[PDB]
From Swiss-Prot, chain A:
GO terms for molecular function: electron transfer activity; metal ion binding. Its cofactor is Cu cation. Keywords: Copper, Disulfide bond, Electron transport, Glycoprotein, Metal-binding, Transport. SUPFAM superfamilies: Cupredoxins (SSF49503). This is Mavicyanin. The keyword Membrane does not apply. CDD domains: Mavicyanin.
Amino acid sequence: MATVHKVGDSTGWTTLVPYDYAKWASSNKFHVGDSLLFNYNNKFHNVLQVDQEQFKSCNSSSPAASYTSGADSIPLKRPGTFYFLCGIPGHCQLGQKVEIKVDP
Amino acid sequence: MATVHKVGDSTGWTTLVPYDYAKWASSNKFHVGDSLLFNYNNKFHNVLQVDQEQFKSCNSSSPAASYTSGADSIPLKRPGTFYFLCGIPGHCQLGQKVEIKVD
Amino acid sequence: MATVHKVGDSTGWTTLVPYDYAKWASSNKFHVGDSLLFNYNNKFHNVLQVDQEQFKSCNSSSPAASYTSGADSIPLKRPGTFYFLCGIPGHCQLGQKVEIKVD
Amino acid sequence: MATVHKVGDSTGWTTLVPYDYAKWASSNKFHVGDSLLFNYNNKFHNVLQVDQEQFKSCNSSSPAASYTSGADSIPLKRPGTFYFLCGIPGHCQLGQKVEIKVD
Ligand SMILES: [Cu+2]
Ligand SMILES: [Cu+2]
Ligand SMILES: [Cu+2]
Ligand SMILES: [Cu+2]
């Protein structure tokens, strides 16, 4: 059964305090058909889908997709690794980025 | 016990022509385990899940969830009533909203 | 085959001077598969697709589609009447709107 | 006996993964009467027809035509070379551009 994964659990998608999104991802199992739910104050953050190179360098200049609702539901349709980060200046560097492994 | 319901059938989720989404919902039977499929031009529409109050007043300010893929597959995993509307300015008022009764 | 119709011909999509877009449309024959090309300075205009009611009242508050490139190519894929207007305040009232009858 | 060429085949027009559009173009033959089909998520990409100069420098400021349907069917009724690129910031630089030689 498809499952909705709330990014950061009760903490959500934020930069208010440090939060290890890599550990959040590791504590979850993502399957095709699942979705990610990003909850945040859209006056301070957004969600951008990028590739591995942009993810590692925190490059938010050329996103493959962008979400700005504050309650974005993003589908995980195929097996592989997906990368998301907040594009607001300096946020990715603060650790607001997450790698999602779908059905490895 | 496992059916995919195409919202608006072949017409999809749109405002180009008047479409009775209420009649579409009433012409279908939704059961837990089923899913909804919203097909639309995602540059011009979106799908927001909201509560009863927001649904009636067409308020798209604080949605519970926002879908923007243009082919959203939304699973119905619990009995009850669910509300969806398009948050693009004025689309909800034109009738692009739908109430789903599950189980 | 298909044909590209340049809206307003050499005059384009503008409000600089009065231009009868209805006459332009009547002098053209639109077929399924054809496209419309709107050329304009996008700092002053845009192109919105609306329904008949909104078209008649120059209501640009809830468009079905929006284009803002200044060189928009819009496909005409089905038989029927389509309506377009510029949504910048007062432009539709100046006559910057056009009804397209496809086949 | 016209032929519809689906740009990027099943992969379509995207930047999600590196895709060699140049190889795609080279592995296909385009003749007058054919058409190109660009399939993509139109909220995140577009198709702009530009000149050789703009193509090389990935300049999308003054396109000859802008397509945004997500399933653009573009007829090729003249021999020669045509240039297309995605105007979304940085996409052209990532390689989302294609040169088409007809006849
Ligand atoms: Cu942020
Ligand atoms: Cu809508
Ligand atoms: Cu105007
Ligand atoms: Cu693009």
